[PDB]
Amino acid sequence: ASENIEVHMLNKGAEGAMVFEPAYIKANPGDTVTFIPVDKGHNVESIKDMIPEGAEKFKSKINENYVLTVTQPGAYLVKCTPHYAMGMIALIAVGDSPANLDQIVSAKKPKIVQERLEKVIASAK
Ligand SMILES: [Cu+2]
């Protein structure tokens, strides 16, 4: 069955300022991911060329509870549009072995983002 996972958007979390909690999401195809802003001023958006081929781009409105359906297997890098430069990202691993994860780790992106992205990848390891 399809499960729903809740992800929160916070000004301050345990890992720092401007975060997605959790920042790492393990899901199966057909799962929904619900993005919930706790504080005002956050949204969720897929980052260009950081979702698997076949997946559709999306961008939520600020403060709305966004329901994302993941169909394609692989890795999804998401961001909060206004705080992406501050490291506000979340990774969604749908299925096993996202082949595009390598491509997501190497893609050009803010240095503070790379730090968080790597750290979540190591913790999931
Ligand atoms: Cu934000």
**Positive or negative, the Cα torsion across 22, 24, 28, 33?**
positive
| 60 DSSP 8-state letter | P
42 labelled binding-site residue: yes
Domain carrying residue 50? 1-125
Q: How far is the CA of 1 from the centre of ligand 1 (A)?
A: 31
Pair of tokens at residue 58: 């999306």
- Method of structure determination: X-ray
8 labelled binding-site residue: no
Q: Is 120 helix (H, G, I), strand (E, B) or coil?
A: helix
Question: From CA 25, how far away is CA 102, in angstroms rounded?
Answer: 17
What resolution (Å)?
2.6
Question: Nearest CA to 77 among 106, 41, 101, 42?
Answer: 101
Q: How far is the CA of 72 from the centre of ligand 1 (A)?
A: 25
Q: How far is the CA of 83 from the centre of ligand 1 (A)?
A: 5
Reported as type and span, the H/E element at residue 31 is: strand 31-37
68 neighbors 77 (Cβ within 8 angstroms): no
The total domain count for the chain is 1
Radius of gyration for the alpha carbons in the chain, expressed in angstroms and rounded? 13
User: What CATH number did the domain enclosing 94 receive?
Assistant: 2.60.40.420
Residue found by looking up tokens 């799962």 in the block: 31
**Positive or negative, the Cα torsion across 122, 115, 18, 37?**
negative
Question: From CA 108, how far away is CA 14, in angstroms rounded?
Answer: 26
CA angle 17, 91, 67 (to 5 degrees): 95
Question: From CA 29, how far away is CA 15, in angstroms rounded?
Answer: 28
